[PDB]
């Protein structure tokens, strides 16, 4: 029987291959009859103007509603016809399209992939019927407080930089967006350096390679030149936005320093970190006897419904903290537990922890790339942001280096002393002030 | 709809390190808490006295 | 082709130590968030979606 | 008795507290000279006499 | 270049236990213990008792208290989850290789010896309460339980969830006694993934021979049909329309699947407007705009429920419902192509590969099977058993569905959601 070790260089290396264009194809050949096929763009709404925010989020909307080869429904119609799911996504930085289909069905998937990316018929009957949906999106998510703190905490985070703004964009950007709007925007960001066609499952490197030089043939390569611009700063501020609101049953809270972006090192020891708080929910079971003594406390005392670590990431910068949900009463409470833990750990983390937190983080990461779609998803975006595939070998090596002291350490750099971003919404009279929560962030012991 | 939520501008109010949306703000962090510190460091000092 | 719940349809709640509570089968609700109007709490008296033990670096 | 302390984290516990207890005494050791001057304890370095 | 695979191992004992393994090189591993033992052998004096047990899969044991348990398994970043339906329970636990056999004994443990103390059943009650209240959020979750209590006067009734008189009620005797008389080796069946058959065999030996409980799949799920309404102004009508179809394994289980393919199941494009699905383009082409429709379908060891589920504004329900029903009609009356079954077929056959892609759904699939049908069906024949289906087998299955005694239920404002009497 092998072991976990062994097992890690198992895993068949990610081929990645570069077309005339600057379109990095990039497969992950496993034995199932399944796989999923995407294109990952670097294209979100960190890059977007103000007067333009909302227009991926827009394009997204028209992505799937006709192409020129294939006219307003006859998309669906291929799809559904061969049984694949073709769905789509979109970050502040990122945007993707995937098809999860049949092994046989690659050419197909990848030919269509093709279509949508390049030639969409932004047809102006429905550009106009998607601004009445989007509206409504909108209000939808609206109702959905958790959606809304993270909007909040990035608008307040971020305050005057690109990255404050939301994807979707603000109603008044919804209904007056043209068509000129959304063809510039692509242009200028649907580009093959920009792109990934990546997948996942029963296929071999080449048939990739000749699909995407037979279907993606035809950008950037009489292109480029003068327009391209990269991506600026963006400051972190620190500071508070409440949004009080007693008609609302519980309170929403997110609180985060700013973390480093996505290429640096020290972000596997924020997750080692994050780990050992870890989560919580109030349908866990096992309450009083959780390892995370956040968790712990919480489930005791009833401190609240949930909650949960986080560690974003953007290009050079991002949101590393907490979020949760809870009682009127429990803010306070909660938020000295929950800074309790963070400098517990810039101060005093101890061994046993530190290697729970890893053990966790290697389940983590093992259990999420599982299926074809997760690791199709993975091959995308890490070409996107590390400019390679990350073996789990690799990762796993980067974990295993983790101990106490670089706990304490990377922990201190990030957190101790450091002003938060907070964001509140709910029932949220006793949300500490601004300073309390400020001086909750370094402690007189130490 | 919560995505019309602005955010008032504050450069009225913060200081120069910080008026910069294109960079970082980890750099003036170490100064601007140093002058604050310094100047509560100070007063205790005198306070002592 | 068995797996009652899988062959989608009748429901399947789980319970779990770290991970969180889920009852979930087949029945219409997707394309009723196309042509919309479909709310949703965001967590009034709840728990929370998507559910965690899953992360990168 | 009293000893459910002893252990390879307490005494990891001790260890990332130690140069703040040795460093936090000598706030209070400096803190006593200075407060009943360099006769009372601690006599020494460029202060006079 | 993959490694080339392996094959799933397969074996009955003699005392009726099976176990089932893949060795997939994988890091992780995965373990589950699938047991007959859902709701549906609960009775009228002890409804409830499956959920409070699924509930207490971290309570002390024999070997391993509470603490242990929590603290020995977030340890290794493992998990232990329990997952119930009408037929089945079963308890899975993961992590990584290297910790198998740790996640085995406590497996065993929480299994096969549980004590359900006194003190520690009672603070868990009101979780069923929590947990419940989580559920029932989804208003598919009142209408699909209330449509089975409406179908069945018998065991596939009972509720997933505990009903309210009982919480706080189930006993720690009848834990126990549900234990000793479900979780028994010939109800049982030890699925494994990345662990070898040896071991998982000699755990069987060794640990899994338990019996002296009950004997097959049931009490026997007597059809009745009926109809269950929740008034509740939601906006939103949900409605179950449904009619008894057949037992999953039975070849006419397969062309009900094919029919709910035809009809319609979930989406297969984000925001779109689901050309290939029959019922929506039927209801939508009379009823403008916020709705839903899908075919429903679920099969069971000895009964099998088929039909469609309804998402409307209250005043469109009548029209939703009606379109939708009048869909099935025309099926059954032969306006059935074959391009159309053909579509379904790969809309079907895509669909199952596609739920054991991953370790998560490839093992519930096989320990559904164990159970189900002591044996493990390739993808290569499930889609061959797919394929025999023809189109007068679906033609068929619609037919049923249209002039079987019908069973529904439904929620929100129902004063325009027709009675049954009125369809």
Request: with cysteine.
């Amino acid at each position: 029987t092998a072991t976990y070790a062994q097992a890690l260089q198992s895993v068949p290396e990610t081929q990645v291959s570069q077309l005339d264009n600057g379109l990095r194809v990039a497969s992950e050949q496993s034995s199932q009859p399944t796989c999923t096929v995407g294109v990952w763009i670097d294209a979100g709404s960190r890059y977007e103007s103000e007067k333009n925010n909302g227009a991926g989020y827009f394009v997204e909307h028209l992505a799937f509603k006709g192409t020129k080869n294939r006219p307003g429904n006859a998309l669906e119609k291929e799809v559904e016809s061969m049984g694949a799911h073709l769905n789509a996504y979109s970050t502040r930085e990122h945007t993707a399209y995937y098809i999860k289909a049949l092994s046989k069905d690659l050419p197909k998937a990848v030919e269509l992939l093709a279509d949508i990316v390049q030639n969409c018929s932004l047809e102006d009957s429905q550009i106009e019927k998607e601004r009445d949906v989007i509206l409504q999106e909108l209000q939808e998510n609206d109702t959905s407080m958790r959606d809304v703190v993270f909007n909040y905490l990035h608008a307040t985070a971020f305050q005057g930089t690109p990255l404050a703004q939301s994807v979707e964009g603000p109603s008044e950007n919804v209904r007056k967006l043209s068509r000129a709007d959304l063809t510039e925007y692509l242009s200028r960001h649907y580009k093959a350096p920009r792109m990934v066609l990546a997948a996942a499952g029963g296929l071999e490197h080449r048939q990739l390679l000749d699909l995407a030089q037979k279907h993606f043939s035809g950008l950037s390569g009489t292109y480029d030149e003068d327009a391209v611009p990269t991506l600026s700063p963006c400051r972190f501020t620190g500071s508070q936005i409440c949004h009080r609101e007693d008609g609302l049953p519980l309170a929403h809270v997110a609180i985060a320093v700013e973390g480093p972006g996505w290429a640096h090192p020290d972000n596997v020891a924020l997750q080692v970190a994050n780990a050992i708080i870890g989560h919580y929910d109030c349908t866990y079971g096992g309450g009083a006897h959780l390892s995370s003594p956040l968790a712990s406390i919480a489930a005791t005392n009833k401190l609240c419904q949930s909650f949960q670590t986080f560690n974003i990431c953007y290009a050079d910068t991002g949101l590393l903290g907490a979020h949760f949900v809870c009682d009127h009463m429990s803010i306070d409470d909660m938020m000295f537990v929950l800074q309790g833990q963070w400098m517990r750990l810039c101060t005093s983390a101890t061994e046993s922890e530190v290697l729970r937190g890893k053990n966790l983080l290697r389940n983590a990461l093992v259990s999420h790339l599982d299926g074809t779609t997760p690791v199709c998803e993975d091959i995308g975006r890490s070409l996107l942001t590390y400019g390679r595939r990350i073996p789990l070998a690799e990762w796993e090596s980067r974990i295993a280096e983790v101990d106490a002291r670089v706990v304490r350490e990377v922990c201190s750099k990030y957190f101790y002393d450091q002003c938060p971003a907070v964001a509140g919404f709910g029932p949220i009279e006793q949300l500490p002030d601004y300073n309390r929560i400020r001086s909750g962030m370094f402690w007189l012991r130490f | 709809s919560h995505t019309d939520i602005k955010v008032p501008d504050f450069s009225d109010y913060r200081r120069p390190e910080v008026l910069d949306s294109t960079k970082s703000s980890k750099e003036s962090s170490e100064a601007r808490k140093g002058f604050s510190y310094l100047v509560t460091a100070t007063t205790t000092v005198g306070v002592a006295y | 082709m068995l797996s009652v719940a899988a062959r989608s349809g009748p429901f399947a709640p789980v319970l779990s130590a770290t991970s969180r509570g889920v009852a979930g089968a087949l029945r219409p609700l997707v394309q009723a968030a196309v042509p919309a109007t479909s709310e949703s709490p965001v967590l009034d008296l709840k728990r929370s979606v998507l559910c965690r033990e899953s992360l990168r670096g | 008795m009293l000893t459910r302390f002893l252990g390879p984290r307490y005494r990891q516990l001790a260890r990332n507290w130690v140069p703040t207890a040795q460093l936090w005494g000598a706030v209070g050791a400096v803190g006593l000279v200075s407060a009943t001057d360099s006769r009372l304890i601690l006599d020494w370095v460029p202060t006079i006499n | 270049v993959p490694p080339h695979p392996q094959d799933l191992e397969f074996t009955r004992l003699p005392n009726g236990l099976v176990i089932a393994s893949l060795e997939n090189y994988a890091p992780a591993s995965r373990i589950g213990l699938f047991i007959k033992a859902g709701s549906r052998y609960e009775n009228s004096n002890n409804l409830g008792t499956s959920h409070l047990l699924r509930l207490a899969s971290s309570l002390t044991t024999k070997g391993a208290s509470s603490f242990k348990i929590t603290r020995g398994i977030e340890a290794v970043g493992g998990k232990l989850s329990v997952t119930s339906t009408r037929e089945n329970m079963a308890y899975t636990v993961e992590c990584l290789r290297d910790d198998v056999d740790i996640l085995m004994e406590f497996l065993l443990n929480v299994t096969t010896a549980p004590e359900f103390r006194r003190w520690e059943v009672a603070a868990l009650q009101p979780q069923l309460r929590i947990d419940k209240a989580v559920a029932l959020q989804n208003p598919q979750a009142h209408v699909i339980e209330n449509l089975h209590a409406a179908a069945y006067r018998n065991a596939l009734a009972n509720s997933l969830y505990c009903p309210d008189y009982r919480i706080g009620k189930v006993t720690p005797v009848e834990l126990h006694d549900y234990v000793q008389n479900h979780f028994t080796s010939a109800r049982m069946a030890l699925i494994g993934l990345g662990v070898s058959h040896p071991v998982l065999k000699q755990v069987a030996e060794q640990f899994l021979n338990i019996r002296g409980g009950l004997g097959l799949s049931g009490a026997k799920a007597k059809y009745h049909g009926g109809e269950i309404r929740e008034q509740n102004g939601d906006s939103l009508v949900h409605a179950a329309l449904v009619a008894e179809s057949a037992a999953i394994g039975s070849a006419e289980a397969n062309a009900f699947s094919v029919l709910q393919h035809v009809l319609g199941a979930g989406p297969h494009v984000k925001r779109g407007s689901n050309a290939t699905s029959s019922l929506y383009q039927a209801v939508a082409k009379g009823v403008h705009q916020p709705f839903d429709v899908s075919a429903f379908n679920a099969s069971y060891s000895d009964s099998g429920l088929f039909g469609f589920y309804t998402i409307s504004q209250a005043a469109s329900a009548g029209d939703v419902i009606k379109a939708a029903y009048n869909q099935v009609k025309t099926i059954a009356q032969g306006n059935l192509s074959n391009p159309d079954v053909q579509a379904a077929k790969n809309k079907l056959k895509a669909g199952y590969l596609m739920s054991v892609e991953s370790s998560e759904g490839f093992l519930d699939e096989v320990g559904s099977q164990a159970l189900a049908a002591g044996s493990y069906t390739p993808p290569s024949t499930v889609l061959q058993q797919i394929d025999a289906v023809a189109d007068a087998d679906v033609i068929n299955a619609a037919k049923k569905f249209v002039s079987g005694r019908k069973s529904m239920a439904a929620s929100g404002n129902l004063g325009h959601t027709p009675f049954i009497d009125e369809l």
